[PDB]
Amino acid sequence: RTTDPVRMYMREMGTVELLTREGEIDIAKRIEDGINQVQSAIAEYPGTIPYILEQFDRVQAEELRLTDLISGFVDPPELAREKFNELRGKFQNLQLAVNEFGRDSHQASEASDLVLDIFREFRLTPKQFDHLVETLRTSMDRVRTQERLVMKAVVKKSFIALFTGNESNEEWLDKVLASDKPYVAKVREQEEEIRRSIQKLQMIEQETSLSVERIKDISHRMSIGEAKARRAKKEMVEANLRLVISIAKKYTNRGLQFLDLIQEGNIGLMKAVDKFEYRRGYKFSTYATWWIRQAITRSIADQARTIRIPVHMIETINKLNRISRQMLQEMGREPLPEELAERMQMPEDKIRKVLKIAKEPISMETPIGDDEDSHLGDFIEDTTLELPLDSATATSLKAATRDVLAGLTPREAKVLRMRFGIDMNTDHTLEEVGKQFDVTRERIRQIEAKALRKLRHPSRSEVLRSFL
Template identity: 70%
Template sequence: MIDKETISEIKNSVNIVDVIGETVALTKAGRNFLGLCPFHGEKTPSFNVVEDKQFYHCFGCGKSGDVFKFIEDYRGVSFMDAVQVIAERAGIPLAAESAGSDRPRQQHPHQALYDIHTEAAKFYHAVLMTTKMGEQARDYLYQRGLTDEVLKHFQIGLAPSEGNYLHQSMAGKFDENTIMNSGLFNLAENNLVYDAFQNRIMFPLTNDSGQVVAFSGRIWQEKPADGHTAKYKNSRATAIFNKSYELYHLDRAKPVIKKSHEVYLMEGFMDVIAAYRAGIENAVASMGTALTPEHVQHLSKYSKKIILSYDGDKAGQAATAKALDELRDLSVEIVRFPDNLDPDEFLAKHSPEDLQHLLTKTRISNVEFLLHYLKPDNIENLQAQIDFLEKMAPIIAKTKSITAQQSYIYMLTDLLSYFEFQQVEQAVNNSRLDGRRERQEEQGYQSYQQAPAVVEQPLSKQLSPLIRAENHLLYRMVHSPLILNQYRLREDFAFATEELQTLYTILLSNGEVTPQDLSQLPDSVQHAWYYMLEANLPEESSDEELREVEETREKELLRKDNQLISKKLREHYHNGNTDAALLDLQQIIEQKEEWSRNGYKTKEVTTLDVQVAEFIRNHKQTGTATDDEINDQLVIPFTLDADGIEDLLQRIQDAGISITDKEGNPSARVLNNEEEEAELSDEELLGSNSAKVNDPVRMYLKEIGVVPLLTNEEEQELAILVEQGDLEAKQRLAEANLRLVVSIAKRYVGRGMQFLDLIQEGNMGLMKAVDKFDYTKGFKFSTYATWWIRQAITRAIADQARTIRIPVHMVETINKLVREQRNLLQELGQDPTPEQIAERMDMTPDKVREILKIAQEPVSLETPIGEEDDSHLGDFIEDEVIENPVDYTTRVVLREQLDEVLDTLTDREENVLRLRFGLDDGKMRTLEDVGKVFNVTRERIRQIEAKALRKLRHPSRSKPLRDFIED
């Protein structure tokens, strides 16, 4: 057994960043390093390596550990094997330490297969390089330009033409089971074993760790002696080889890929060797199979940038087009080889410098490639051009760079004689809008029609105050023997968190927690250990610090008890068990008195506010919350009266969260609160000054005011008819409650949406209520509709609040920063840091971070905006209340300038803006009203409006209007 001191020495002799960096492409991110997790598939890096504390943690799957744990999990070996691997890397001999151990070192379950492939590779290479039978094959390879150095680097060998040379060499070293499962031998009908590869040039294939796992044999004579006609013959699948995953030359290419942040993907082994001869060492190839999702996942661990370098013939170009679909989530460039050549054939006709230039200087984008590949032969035919445009428009629309999009549109226009630039541009824009609509519909379907996927969140994202306090205490115990001894004397002390208590027990027994101790613990305990180590605490601790942490811990324990008792009280009360509820109440009162005596004053309002804010954040994505979730996740003080509870529910609903029961129907508790809301009169609709009611609204109110209200019996009769599919009953039920929509909409005026838009959103909620109304629950339809109308309006307001309006000069600054960020990404091969962007843009890193934050996150009207922080978004809101002569003159000049700017838009865009914002008659229209004018949907009007506003933000159009914005 290796002693603890030696294990610590081995661990301290290596840097975990260097070890993991050989497997995962890591980039510096602050003090830590970031990369794609090797333990689960992901597109956004979440795998963190903490160099100063020598451990890793994935925020996606929760995996964490030290350098030994990484080797254990990645290679599937035991802890002692992981120690052996790191010791060999560090050059620390373990023979002396391990000699006294009676337990043999545990080997990899497939170690024998690795060993036989290693021996076979040595055998084949020796046959080629040192035997007379290999002399002719060597001459053949020399003639193809391969040198001894290349043959050695790639360990190229020769399989003898006789049928059992390899078997004779391996029979005395390995058992029969290993031989037959290796894939290197076949069994004849007479039960004789013979070599699977005969008279072929042998290319060994290695895994990421450099272990030989398979071979590919290539014919080298016109009429091979073994009679095979296939150009290549590959090893069959074994326990250590999956041809859909492994990549040729990857283990040797990894260091170069790590430095260059890109990898060449080729079709054949000889192509990779040709690239190596030309000085390109970061090339790999798939093995006798098309590119698979497993290949892509394998490649993405090392680089996000792929250079496709497939053959130049039709088959190679078709393979390139197919590979682009698999590589759609990565950055891809293509090298096109002329004259139908592959890299090996190109090198045979040109110099290594020519091949290097072709691979490094002539790359094209995937869109450029597809423009050539998809171009029809009969391009002069009109229908062929239409089909070509329909294929290319969605491809160009997916390009993120607007500049690149414009270039591709020009290139495509040059190929289409029947189309003008504007027509091609419109086709691309339509494809982009269609794609956006499909994504929105898909997201909406997933959000409202499917239950959200249950993904186990990393513990660090759900740490409660109790766990944080206990992590703090354990951190101090681990780093201070004095503090540990203080708690050792407290026999009554124990951690409430089970995982931390397990670690505390080991700490008390051994005085430390070693890597070997961790290797024998469950994953949950290991994760808890590394989460605890993540705490960035000062080296010095004080009694005051520990006392505050203890107070926080005790307070959380008491609060947890109170939460459990409060839950029991509610259950007893709802079940009618008054006596038990009173006992629970008495216990809560006694507990509150205990809190007061011990100095832990309760702050009911503040605590509840924090809970509600956290509750809203957790349920914002799904947009719904059930009664049970409110009861379980919110500790509602028993002193909160009915009005307070109603306000609490209203806060949740105003945040755009629907409160439902388990079946997804409106909560009975909420519906009870809506009863009073539904009792309205016609006078209330027109008599309130809370909303500015213009003539169209008054006419609308008069129309709906003549529709008689329904009795409960009439509502039930209509509901039954609606269930039977009666459309007239559905319309009557809705029309009778239109005034309810107006009443509720008035309460939300001034919150970012026009009154007409609020009414329109409310009407959509009303139609939802008609479809969902369940008269059997005993509620009136107006009560039920109030809930649905309120949900529709509050959700629309919440969506509107996410729209950020930023001044034009700030948009220009953001766009400039994004362009420089993109340029640096192409130059560096990785995302640039704020410091690198700041150096390029001649500004401070803090300013860059601020601009990036503004570009990504919503800002309030009071947030300073601009390069000098001297203006606010609120400053750009026009005051229309008072109009003096100066304002009148300004307005006239502004209208003239506005007309000139609007003339630069298309007729449809100009008319949509004039109708939508009432630029001619002062009456703003809803999206639906404008849609009726143009005979299109409201969604189409929204798209036209958004596009027109984007055009108006351009400096060439916005500059004439800037002088009208008051300072």
């Protein structure tokens, strides 16, 4: 019924209900809960804790940034040192009791649970969070690819039955080699391929020491946590699209269209959702407005001009315009460059430089004068072209130079030709000119001097004089 994309956007956004305070706290709780499940899933990994421990070891030596390690502490290096020392000691205890007493024994499970509880009181910077997630994601993707490649090679129920505990164990290979069903012939050939596959498997498993069940369950809880978190962020973003529109309404007619501002504010709102804290007690709009405004202003500074001006120079131009407005209001006339420089506490030359770059390119289709069928683009010349008179003069100069050089002995004529690049691609220094004659450089220099002296005689230089 309508063709305007803006109206369609308002239609789609209007079908969502505006949240209240309790709803915002609930969705923030869901985000935190999902992030907590993701962090717990990462923590149940033999390679996750060593990375954090070595990062702390480098940080405590005053060699790495403290902010890059952690960003906060969960409360239900004055304090960081004690907590990290406790974490290191607990990791040592877990490594002591991980396998010596038994994986299934109560000691290992209790130690892992308390390690999870300790790690839950940590707020990591998202960069290494994503790094740790990416390591396990790549491991899981490789495991999935190997499993699917094996299934493609063999090609069902039989694999599933022995998948629970014998997916990567050699017992599956031995039993299938023992199998003698009619299709096990080619399958045994494909078992060879599985061998080539499974050889790539154990080096992963010893890297994790978790076989297949454990890594699958870790991937599962990571997936559920990520899904819950993503749904909660989507809910808040959909709720606050209206606030995004309300903020972006004020920046129209500044080089960007309404929808572009809306989308950039949506990205800023996504960032605000990604780094919100409900414990502070403030409403979501308070924090989200700053990020939406930042995104919109940066997008205007970056994408509103054909000739891009950096953001800081854009701010300088805007503040100059504000001061010019205030001064014109104060004194009643247009401020002069010197007075503007005095008020800005900036050099006058910089003020003039800023004033000369605040121009938007004019369109070539603009009607010229009072006419309507004439355009500016029809009055722009091609200054890079060469006039045909100039080209004819160049041809005549080439012919005259050839004629004059023909009045010399071949030695000096070719010396001049090679020293100036006449009828050749490249100019040559004295050494290459001397090499062909086998003579040294100085003789070439005086040969060129003799040629120049002879060519300065007016008996054979009148035709060449007319080109000056």
